[PDB]
Amino acid sequence: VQPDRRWFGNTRVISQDALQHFRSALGETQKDTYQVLLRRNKLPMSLLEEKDADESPKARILDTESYAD
Amino acid sequence: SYKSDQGGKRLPRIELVEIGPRLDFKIGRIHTPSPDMVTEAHKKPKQKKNVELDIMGDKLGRIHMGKQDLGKLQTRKMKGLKSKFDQG
Amino acid sequence: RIWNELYKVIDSSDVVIHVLDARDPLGTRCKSVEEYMKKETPHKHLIYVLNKCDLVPTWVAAAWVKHLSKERPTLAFHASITNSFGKGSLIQLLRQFSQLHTDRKQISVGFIGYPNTGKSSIINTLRKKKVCQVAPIPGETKVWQYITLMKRIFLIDCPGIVPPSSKDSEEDILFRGVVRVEHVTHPEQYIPGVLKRCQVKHLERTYE
Amino acid sequence: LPVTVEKPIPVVYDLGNLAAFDSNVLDKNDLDSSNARREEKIKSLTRDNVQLLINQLLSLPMKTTTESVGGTGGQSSVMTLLQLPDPTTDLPREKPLPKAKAMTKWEKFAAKKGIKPKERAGKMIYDEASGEWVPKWGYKGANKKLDDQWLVEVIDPRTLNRAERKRLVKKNEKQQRRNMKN
Amino acid sequence: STLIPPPSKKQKKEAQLPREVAIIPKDLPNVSIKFQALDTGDNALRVPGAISEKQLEELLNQLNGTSVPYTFSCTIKASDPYSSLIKPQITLLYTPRAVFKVKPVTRSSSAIAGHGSTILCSAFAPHTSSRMVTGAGDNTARIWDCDTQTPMHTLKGHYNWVLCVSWSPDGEVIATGSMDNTIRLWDPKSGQCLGDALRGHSKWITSLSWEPIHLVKPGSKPRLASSSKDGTIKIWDTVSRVCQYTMSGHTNSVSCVKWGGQGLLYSGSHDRTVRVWDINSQGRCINILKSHAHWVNHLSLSTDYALRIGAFDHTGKKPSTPEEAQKKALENYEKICKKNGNSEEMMVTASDDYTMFLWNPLKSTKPIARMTGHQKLVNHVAFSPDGRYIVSASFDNSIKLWDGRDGKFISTFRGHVASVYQVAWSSDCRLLVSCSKDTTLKVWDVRTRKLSVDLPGHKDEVYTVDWSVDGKRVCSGGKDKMVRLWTH
Amino acid sequence: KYTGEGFVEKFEDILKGFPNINDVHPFHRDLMDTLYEKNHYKISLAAISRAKSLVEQVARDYVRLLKFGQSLFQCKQLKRAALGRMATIVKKLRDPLAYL
RNA sequence: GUGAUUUCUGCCCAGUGCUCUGAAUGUCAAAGUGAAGAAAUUCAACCAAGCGCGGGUAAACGGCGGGAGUAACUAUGACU
Ligand SMILES: Nc1nc2c(ncn2[C@@H]2O[C@H](COP(=O)(O)OP(=O)(O)OP(=O)(O)O)[C@@H](O)[C@H]2O)c(=O)[nH]1
Ligand SMILES: [Mg+2]
Structure with a gap:
């Protein structure tokens, strides 16, 4: 493997305007039962998920009283 | 442009001022384009049915089910649906 | 398989x-x-x-x-x-x-x-x-x-599948035709189900 | 005071050029070269058009951003820009469209059979003794190595090698000229 | 980079038609509207139509008898301020504006060099934005002339890190709580060691707090309050430099110390319990509140903004005598606090169980509400200067905005990609800046719950953020050993 | 397969022996609550139940991997990898197995 | 070719697919006849073959999303 300046270069940046646009365009789906998918347009999907919840999951009790306490 | 008060802060009332020049023009001789050159000078550089690109990317396609008339399809004449074998 | x-x-x-x-x-x-x-x-x-x-x-x-x-x-x-x-x-x-x-x-x-x-x-x-x-x-x-x-x-x-649902019957698989009825052992214990599913009027006309 | 004004025949717009096209009725005996009230009519029959045009321009979609100064592209967060549609009037070009499709006989030979193009990955090779990556052509290219070798092991053979390279270079240039003449 | 999908062909062919210019037609078919305030006022039956939204303001001024500004809204359904009929008898709700506009903070001034280690804490002077203090990972603090972007008056005198700096609420002295358990005071204009290092704690100092000016004896100076990892809460008077009397209620480390408007210190600790001390009772805790499940970090009061400046309003003036000073300070506190006429200061708690609690420790010992919805620990919480908005930051990259009166949920501010370490309000309670574990700082516009600007320029994490009092500058700094000032 | 069955069977006897503090009787429930800390009691048993599924998935995957091996070396290495991931799943239960 | 009987109007109102008693004024390379004005230019008429006109064919080579608009002339159906 030769040395090169690619490899140590960023490849897939994205900006805040695109992030906000795509995130706002995931609560307007309106699925059609007669449209089928052909391609999916690879996107960073772990940044556009996470609709708001109301739960706030349980806290870890093991960090205060382990078991010998 | 000045404040209007008839159209809110969006649309103002505008005013013009004449700066220059100020010319008149009368027609002289002309030389008109030939048909071939006219058809060769209006060219768009060249840079899909049922296929659409959604927002988010998402190349999608329509499938267009037909019309389905079940007025055909004579249902099978099973023996229990024939009243001839009625046990009375 | x-x-x-x-x-x-x-x-x-x-x-x-x-x-x-x-x-x-x-x-x-x-x-x-x-x-x-x-x-x-x-x-x-x-x-x-x-x-x-x-x-x-x-x-x-x-x-x-x-x-x-x-x-x-x-x-x-x-x-x-x-x-x-x-x-x-x-x-x-x-x-x-x-x-x-x-x-x-x-x-x-x-x-x-x-x-x-x-x-x-x-x-x-x-x-x-x-x-x-x-x-x-x-x-x-x-x-x-x-x-x-x-x-x-x-x-x-391809061959036909039956998902291994760990519930819902042993006698529903029979009436959704899956089993070859020649192999079930006491086949008379299932007839109440046939009487329940079908109609008396229809059943009276096929035997007669 | 009114930001609006009515005209019988509707003005046509070209927002892609910021242009209006009015086709209402003029008065032949108003704009004559000697009529006193000439400017007070021109400047107003054009001012109503400009009013309609600003009304139309101030209602387009706006494009905001969240960047800041230094942004290599353009606008920053404190600039709203209007998204202009495309022009419609067919205005002619100035040069014809570019098209030059010659096959040069290599694109014919390579395509009759299945010679595909090369991946065009990199320019370096690996020299074995020494232990460097020695551009194949681009700095002391592996070609120009029999030139400064400290012995060749058979007229000077290195100069003959240079001549044999130059012959292929000139043949390639001649082939190119012939193809371009075809 | 990743691109927004391009517009289609039919959309291009659509965008050329004539398009939708509004006209404001006539337009006074008059609707009877109900002018009603937020607190209690419903003041009284007027029937206007489509009139100037700045003339509604004048209506209210001449009606309530002052000619002030008023913001408006309707039908608290989507609760939005002819614009009430373009989309669709109708009521009207209003709030006072106290107009003092703060332009956003967009650009970036010079990246000031400085210390030789990271920068831990930073604070702005309450009287002018021209000076500002930063304590850093070396054994020193520094003062910066923000007027010319230059250094000044480095304050040597510790021998371990400086973990918190505070500028007294009168602009007279600065206090530096350090790692070696000393506490030192310094003069702004000179830079001399004002005495020796106060001490008495066995482990490091976590937080400091000052006596609010509207309770200090005219002719005297405010006092201190110091938290320490050992668990003690110590008081200090800055003339005799004597430990007045300590408090030793908690058992684990204590995180933060406050000081209320009636003389009630509040303190949350790593023992999952919030205690309410007292100063008129020589320092015996009168209330213990145990509601959280994990330990507590960065308690915060409802008036901790007004209590931070003490008669130095947004116009940069000064007092000449404690007589006028005390009246100005009382006026400030009443302007901020008096929304029913009583001392209705509330408290908000932030703990490592993802949930915050809304206390009114005076009226009762029960929480008014339990604010919940985060998914990781909550590192920081803050009240609006006018007290009717709570903002909370958390290690799950989000920020949440709650209604600060009863504790409802309003909105979420997404946009960071790493943990949010702290947040900060502006003077007019309309913007909000925030710093994060990744580089960028972000400015949010609360009036619409969106992102206004996103400013990078640091190179490593960012630990502090401080907006000025008159909104002129924003200071930040962190792991890259540079100070940074952002302006409009 | 044999070691997978071994760990799974050592865990089943723990998951089927303890008395299921929820839905027994609100007297014994509260007594065991004041005696063993119901939270920790349920947490350790959920830890063991989770390990029981992790081990089974590891065993299931590495058999499928082995059936494509082409030499004694590679097959032996896959065997050792599987047994090591099992051992490392188990060695994290030092605290729950000591409380239980 | 198929394989008693009974079922077998099958994805084809498919005419450029497997043939021609039938055709046309839809077009039409280049050629040739008419007009303007000094002339390049522009326009009228005549037109070889394929492509729109149509009958026809049943195990039937291989070839295919349907129904409208009836070209605001197209650079091999650039469309809607
Ligand atoms: N009445 C009726 N019977 C049908 C119909 N279609 C199939 N059958 C009967 O259902 C049975 C279907 O057998 P198969 O076509 O092999 O169905 P399958 O078991 O899913 O197919 P395999 O993949 O070969 O196993 C046959 O005995 C048919 O006689 C139908 O449309 N109507
Ligand atoms: Mg089958």
């Missing part, structure tokens, strides 16, 4: 059709794999075909197509070779699916469902000759089989 044919057909097939029984479709539905195809293979299409439609009234069949067409396309069929119903509707929809993938050199469509629903009979009526073996006994087709039509679309039939 057959769940290894299922995933192989799903892998090789561009478009899947899930076949149901017009008598009771919600029992033969076999959801259980649509969650899979949705999670791991979203680029596959999965339409419904509801055949054996000449064994139910016409309003029943229309109602079932309507109530099923709120998830997938769900065409309605009747598979004989000479006298069929729906062959043109299926052909002129496979032609659409083939035009959409106009740069793939061929498309494959796979038939899946419970046993004894008519997967082989649909291929036979589409092609108009006896291509794959059909028989009233459940376990007829055992391995997958390729079959060509139109030079650009292949059809694949």
